[PDB]
Design an enzyme around this catalytic site. Structure first.
Site, mmCIF file in Angstrom:
data_model
loop_
_atom_site.group_PDB
_atom_site.id
_atom_site.type_symbol
_atom_site.label_atom_id
_atom_site.label_comp_id
_atom_site.label_asym_id
_atom_site.label_seq_id
_atom_site.Cartn_x
_atom_site.Cartn_y
_atom_site.Cartn_z
ATOM 1 N N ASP A 127 0.791 -1.230 0.000
ATOM 2 C CA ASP A 127 0.000 0.000 0.000
ATOM 3 C C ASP A 127 0.831 1.292 0.000
ATOM 4 O O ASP A 127 0.646 2.158 0.855
ATOM 5 C CB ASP A 127 -0.976 -0.024 1.191
ATOM 6 C CG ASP A 127 -2.053 1.061 1.110
ATOM 7 O OD1 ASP A 127 -2.561 1.462 2.176
ATOM 8 O OD2 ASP A 127 -2.411 1.506 -0.005
ATOM 9 N N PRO A 130 2.027 8.533 -0.745
ATOM 10 C CA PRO A 130 2.714 9.703 -0.179
ATOM 11 C C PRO A 130 2.519 9.967 1.308
ATOM 12 O O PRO A 130 3.407 10.499 1.967
ATOM 13 C CB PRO A 130 2.207 10.861 -1.046
ATOM 14 C CG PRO A 130 1.019 10.291 -1.796
ATOM 15 C CD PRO A 130 1.404 8.881 -2.030
#
Ligand SMILES: COc1ccc2c(c1)/C(=C/c1cnc[nH]1)C(=O)N2
Length: 298
Positions: A127, A130
């Protein structure tokens, strides 16, 4: 847990609720992660406990340190080290000017190093995003919150369910591949690389089908020519609209040719044809890499 005084909500996630805490005894600030359990209909909480402890021995300069794991009751907590900012807050605070290329390149090189590391141990993140990437004042960046092969516990009802942002999800995961490899992380990283350059998410899909079609419209619909076995995949449908492939000059400007090439190898439809983390480190794009420091408002 009572041995930690919360400071503020540092984050979220499908896995738990991240908080900035201070050790009442030590004094040092940590990043405590609340993972609630579903004792109503629980499943393999001991199979997971071991997969979590295997992360404690996963030390690398580009991987947020998992200090310790404390299992008390219906909750399971993960004590992580603390860094001052996530790449989302930094990118947003840089949408006006734009993150300098030397800094974008430094970041990608480190991410690829840490990713290369954990990969050589058959460990995936699954997963990448940012908000899961943590940066410090000294110019370093780390990968945070490695998802398990199968998450557990109980989903968040306030934050609005389990499945939310699937912007950096690899096409193989979207097409139904249950046994995906290290390539999923490279795709995700490739999507972060692009967003940092253009200052706009590469593929901002609302749903699964939209995410997949958002990727198709840009890179063209995959077929047996470019991705052998794509049509035999679990969720593929012959009725998939057939779009044309777009030039990366139009996709990621003004990235130089060296960048467009590397990113192009990170976003290959065929997982087995996608570039590996350690292979991407030898790319000519990293010829003149350095480690500049970021301008941070904390
Ligand atoms: C998501 O998972 C994690 C795990 C450990 C962490 C942070 C986030 C984290 C996020 C964060 C966002 N603003 C400063 N730190 C941190 O400092 N340590």
């Amino acid at each position: 847990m009572e041995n930690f005084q919360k400071v503020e909500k540092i984050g979220e996630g499908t896995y738990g609720v991240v908080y900035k805490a201070r050790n009442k005894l030590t004094g040092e600030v940590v990043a405590l992660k609340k993972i609630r359990l579903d004792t109503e209909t629980e499943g393999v909480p001991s199979t997971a406990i071991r997969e979590i402890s295997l992360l404690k021995e996963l030390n690398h300069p580009n991987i947020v340190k998992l200090l310790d794991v404390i299992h008390t009751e219906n909750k399971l907590y993960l004590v992580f080290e603390f860094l001052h900012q996530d790449l989302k807050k930094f990118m947003d605070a840089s949408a006006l000017t734009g993150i300098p290329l030397p800094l974008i390149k430094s970041y990608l090189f480190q991410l690829l190093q840490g990713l290369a590391f954990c990969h050589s141990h058959r460990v995936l993140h699954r997963d990448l995003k940012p908000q899961n990437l943590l940066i410090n004042t000294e110019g370093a960046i780390k990968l945070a919150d490695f998802g398990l092969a199968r998450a557990f516990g109980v989903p968040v009802r306030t934050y609005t369910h389990e499945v939310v942002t699937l912007w950096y999800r690899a096409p193989e995961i979207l097409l139904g591949c249950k046994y995906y490899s290290t390539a999923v992380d490279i795709w995700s990283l490739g999507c972060i690389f692009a967003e940092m350059v253009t200052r706009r998410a590469l593929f901002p899909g609302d749903s699964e089908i939209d995410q997949l079609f958002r990727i198709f419209r840009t890179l063209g619909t995959p077929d047996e020519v470019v991705w052998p076995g794509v049509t035999s995949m679990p969720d593929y449908k012959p009725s998939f609209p057939k779009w044309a492939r777009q030039d990366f000059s139009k996709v990621v400007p003004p990235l130089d040719e060296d960048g467009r090439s590397l990113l192009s190898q990170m976003l290959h439809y065929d997982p087995n044809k996608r570039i590996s983390a350690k292979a991407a480190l030898a790319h000519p794009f990293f010829q003149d890499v350095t480690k500049p420091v970021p301008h941070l408002r904390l």
